[PDB]
Amino acid sequence: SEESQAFQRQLTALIGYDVTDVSNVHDDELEFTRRGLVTPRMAEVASRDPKLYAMHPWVTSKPLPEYLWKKIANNCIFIVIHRSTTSQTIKVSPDDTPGAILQSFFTKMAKDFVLRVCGRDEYLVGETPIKNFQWVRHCLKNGEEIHVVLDTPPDPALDEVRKEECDRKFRVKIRGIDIPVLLTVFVEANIQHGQQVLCQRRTSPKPFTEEVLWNVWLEFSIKIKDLPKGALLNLQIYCLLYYVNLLLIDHRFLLRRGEYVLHMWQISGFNADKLTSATNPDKENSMSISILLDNHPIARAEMPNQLRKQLEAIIATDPLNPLTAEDKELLWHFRYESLKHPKAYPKLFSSVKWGQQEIVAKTYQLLARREVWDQSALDVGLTMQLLDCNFSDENVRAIAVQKLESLEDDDVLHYLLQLVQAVKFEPYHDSALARFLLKRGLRNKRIGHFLFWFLRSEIAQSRHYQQRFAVILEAYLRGCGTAMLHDFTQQVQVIEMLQKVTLDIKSLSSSQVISQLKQKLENLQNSQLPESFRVPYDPGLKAGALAIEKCKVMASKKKPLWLEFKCADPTALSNETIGIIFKHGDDLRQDMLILQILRIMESIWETESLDLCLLPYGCISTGDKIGMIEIVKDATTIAKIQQSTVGNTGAFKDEVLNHWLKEKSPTEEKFQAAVERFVYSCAGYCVATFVLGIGDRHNDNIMITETGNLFHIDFGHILGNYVPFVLTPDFLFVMGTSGKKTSPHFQKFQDICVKAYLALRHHTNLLIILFSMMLMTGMPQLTSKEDIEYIRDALTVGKNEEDAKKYFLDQIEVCRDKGWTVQFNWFLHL
Numbered sequence: 001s002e003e004s005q006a007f008q009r010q011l012t013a014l015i016g017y018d019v020t021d022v023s024n025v026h027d028d029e030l031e032f033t034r035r036g037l038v039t040p041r042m043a044e045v046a047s048r049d050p051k052l053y054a055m056h057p058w059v060t061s062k063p064l065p066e067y068l069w070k071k072i073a074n075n076c077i078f079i080v081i082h083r084s085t086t087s088q089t090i091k092v093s094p095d096d097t098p099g100a101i102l103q104s105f106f107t108k109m110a111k112d113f114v115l116r117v118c119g120r121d122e123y124l125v126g127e128t129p130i131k132n133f134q135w136v137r138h139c140l141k142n143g144e145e146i147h148v149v150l151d152t153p154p155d156p157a158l159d160e161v162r163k164e165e166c167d168r169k170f171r172v173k174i175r176g177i178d179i180p181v182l183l184t185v186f187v188e189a190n191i192q193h194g195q196q197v198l199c200q201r202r203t204s205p206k207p208f209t210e211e212v213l214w215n216v217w218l219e220f221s222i223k224i225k226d227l228p229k230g231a232l233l234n235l236q237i238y239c240l241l242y243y244v245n246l247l248l249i250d251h252r253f254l255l256r257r258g259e260y261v262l263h264m265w266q267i268s269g270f271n272a273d274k275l276t277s278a279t280n281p282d283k284e285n286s287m288s289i290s291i292l293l294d295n296h297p298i299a300r301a302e303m304p305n306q307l308r309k310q311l312e313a314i315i316a317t318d319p320l321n322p323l324t325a326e327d328k329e330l331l332w333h334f335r336y337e338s339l340k341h342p343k344a345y346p347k348l349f350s351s352v353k354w355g356q357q358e359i360v361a362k363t364y365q366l367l368a369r370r371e372v373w374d375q376s377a378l379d380v381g382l383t384m385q386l387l388d389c390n391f392s393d394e395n396v397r398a399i400a401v402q403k404l405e406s407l408e409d410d411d412v413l414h415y416l417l418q419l420v421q422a423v424k425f426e427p428y429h430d431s432a433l434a435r436f437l438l439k440r441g442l443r444n445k446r447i448g449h450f451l452f453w454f455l456r457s458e459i460a461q462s463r464h465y466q467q468r469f470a471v472i473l474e475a476y477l478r479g480c481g482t483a484m485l486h487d488f489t490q491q492v493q494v495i496e497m498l499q500k501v502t503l504d505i506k507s508l509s510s511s512q513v514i515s516q517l518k519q520k521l522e523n524l525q526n527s528q529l530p531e532s533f534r535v536p537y538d539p540g541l542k543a544g545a546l547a548i549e550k551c552k553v554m555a556s557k558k559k560p561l562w563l564e565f566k567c568a569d570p571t572a573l574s575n576e577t578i579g580i581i582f583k584h585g586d587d588l589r590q591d592m593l594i595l596q597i598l599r600i601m602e603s604i605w606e607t608e609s610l611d612l613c614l615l616p617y618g619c620i621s622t623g624d625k626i627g628m629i630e631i632v633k634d635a636t637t638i639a640k641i642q643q644s645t646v647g648n649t650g651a652f653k654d655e656v657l658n659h660w661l662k663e664k665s666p667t668e669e670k671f672q673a674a675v676e677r678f679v680y681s682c683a684g685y686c687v688a689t690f691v692l693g694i695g696d697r698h699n700d701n702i703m704i705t706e707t708g709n710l711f712h713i714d715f716g717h718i719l720g721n722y723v724p725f726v727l728t729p730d731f732l733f734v735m736g737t738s739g740k741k742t743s744p745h746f747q748k749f750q751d752i753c754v755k756a757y758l759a760l761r762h763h764t765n766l767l768i769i770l771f772s773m774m775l776m777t778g779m780p781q782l783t784s785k786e787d788i789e790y791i792r793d794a795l796t797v798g799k800n801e802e803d804a805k806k807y808f809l810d811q812i813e814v815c816r817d818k819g820w821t822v823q824f825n826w827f828l829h830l
């Protein structure tokens with residue numbers, strides 16, 4: 001068509017990369033996957049209830065926690081309804097369904113419509129108890145009234161989707177390399193499967209010059225018939241300067257034959273990029289390498305006591321404890337006993353010699369007998385581990401994905417960020433995981449909204465993986481709907497203009513500066529910007545006009561914008577603005593990863609009726625060293641609370657914070673809250689920050705609210721260029737204690753710590769796989785391997801709870817002993 005040739009022009013502005021281009025490819029895998037995805041998209045589209053998908057309730061089926069029942073008086077919750085300007089409060093039992101709340105409104109008063117939340121694009125539709133809606137649970141948690149404005153349901157029609165239509169050893173010739181500019185140099189060629197190295201050959205050292213030829217045949221000691229699907233020819237160049245990869249078996253199961261001229265990635269300064277099947281786009285600068293392939297089809301007893309226990313002691317250890325050869329042979333030989341334990345599956349499948357046809361054969365035999373796995377309750381940590389870089393076999397990976405299909409929307413959103421990062425571990429573009437994320441993001445607008453920005457973030461700052469991601473996004477967009485498709489267009493229009501203002505103001509560096517900013521913010525507020533837009537980190541909110549008066553640039557080398565917006569929705573029960581920081585220079589990708597692990601930890605604590613009161617504030621990476629950050633209301637930096645009444649000195653006073661807190665409390669009662677709120681929040685971050693190894697931080701990078709909530713910021717600043725945590729004399733002061741001593745609050749502190757710390761240890765393996773995946777996909781440079789193992793030590797694995805409660809309280813003590821040494825040390829950092 002012609003429209004459809006322009007429709008693709010919009011997608012390409014939404015995606016941020018051109019997926020029709022075919023100039024940095026060397027085969028039809030991408031078109032093949034774009035093509036392959038057409039089906040699961042239309043498949044999912046045709047299956048979503050059009051209504052429930054237009055109104056996208058945000059529900060959970062988990063149990064309403066204790067701390068929120070004990071915040072309810074008596075099976076009685078209050079929902080303040082709004083029609084016009086009339087109010088009316090009503091009684092509700094936590095078990096009252098939203099649909100039956102109208103059989104209590106068109107009947108419970110006399111002398112069609114659906115309940116929408118005031119100020120937000122959030123509804124309470126569908127057959128759920130209201131105690132189970134997230135918004136309700138958020139209003140309960142922070143002591144707030146539930147305001148709904150009854151009105152007309154959106155029209156599914158606006159969601160409508162636009163209409164569719166041999167024993168021969170393997171060998172490879174290294175013709176030679178060539179860099180358009182500069183030593184001795186040789187080529188390494190490895191056959192890899194899941195970080196496992198099947199064979200390795202080399203070249204003769206040639207003289208490092210702008211061109212180098214070899215015309216050699218490197219014969220491998222692997223039979224053609226023993227190549228497993230998903231095996232990579234991995235080509236590298238030492239003097240290690242460059243790598244590139246090529247799948248030996250292809251998306252159509254063909255042995256790869258022909259000539260290839262592959263352009264190569266440079267090292268700099270382990271991680272996920274190094275695994276990509278993508279060649280460099282930058283053909284002008286990139287060293288390349290030329291090669292040639294011509295060579296096609298593709299195809300229980302008992303146990304000694306000591307052995308069983310030796311096997312038991314293997315199954316039990318954490319995901320990072322290395323497997324010896326003796327360990328592996330033992331898992332393999334007793335594989336059938338090993339299959340009875342879902343916990344065994346990562347290590348058992350790491351015992352497989354994947355370079356051997358017949359072994360792989362038996363492994364698939366093993367997978368066919370999968371009932372104990374199939375029948376076991378979903379364990380996400382177990383499941384994440386089969387999706388990491390250690391597994392290249394499709395059938396193994398796909399049984400992990402099968403296990404994820406049972407996640408309800410709530411939990412998909414907890415792990416969405418890292419499931420999307422996990423795509424980098426997929427050997428091929430079309431996978432069960434890439435299709436799984438398609439389905440869940442086509443079924444649910446909140447998942448799909450977030451999926452858009454996660455994918456879009458990667459496309460804009462990763463050339464290693466943008467193509468694969470581009471293809472997944474396109475497939476998403478062709479199924480989200482015109483409504484959302486238009487809503488996504490509003491959003492990108494806005495954040496591209498603001499990024500522009502962001503980078504511009506940044507270069508201009510002040511007295512003058514404050515002038516320009518306000519002036520550019522005057523332009524955009526005409527007929528270039530639309531009237532409003534969903535805040536990307538909180539799809540619930542629509543931002544209207546820029547409170548120009550309130551906007552500003554900030555003191556900070558790289559100089560972020562402090563923007564504020566009016567809520568674009570009239571039914572908004574207040575006139576508080578929406579506050580966003582736009583910033584360049586920080587790797588906000590790392591911040592996303594840490595923030596989301598924080599939400600997971602909050603969630604692990606919920607399982608055990610704890611609320612450690614963290615503030616994982618919204619954060620969306622939009623490009624390389626650029627993105628936006630949600631503003632927390634009524635907050636200041638801890639430093640600043642010191643700079644207030646000691647002023648830019650370092651002469652740290654122990655009394656200031658408990659003063660500032662009383663200085664900000666409306667009463668003495670609300671003051672105690674701010675002290676209740678503080679001791680929890682302080683311990684929440686102390687534990688969480690210590691586990692991740694980002695607890696040794698600087699005074700300026702920690703904040704509090706005029707109501708007691710502590711929370712860390714800037715997590716890129718450490719994991720991004722890099723005492724146990726931070727439990728300082730000022731913090732302890734609010735906790736009643738001084739120097740060396742004790743008090744009722746401080747002990748409470750310690751009891752909340754030890755509970756929280758222990759509660760995370762219950763989920764050791766989960767945390768470890770998440771930490772481990774984070775470093776590989778999001779911490780460039782910071783891998784080493786011996787970075788990974790930190791969280792092993794941190795979570796004090798192998799130790800008893802008793803040894804555990806101990807170790808943490810001691811970690812706490814290094815906080816009393818050091819006092820100010822470090823904060824002052826960080827200050828003295830000029």
Ligand SMILES: Cc1ccc(-c2ccc3ncc4c(c3n2)n(C2CCN(C(=O)[C@H](C)O)CC2)c(=O)n4C)cn1
Pocket residue numbers: 554556560581583586591617629630631632635636713714715716717
């Ligand atoms: C990487 C990174 C950057 C910013 C933030 C961040 C997050 C929430 C904030 N809320 C209020 C507030 C902030 C905030 N800064 N800020 C600052 C903190 C310091 N800052 C930085 O960029 C630090 C120095 O790197 C600018 C934003 C405020 O002033 N207020 C009131 C988190 N991570």
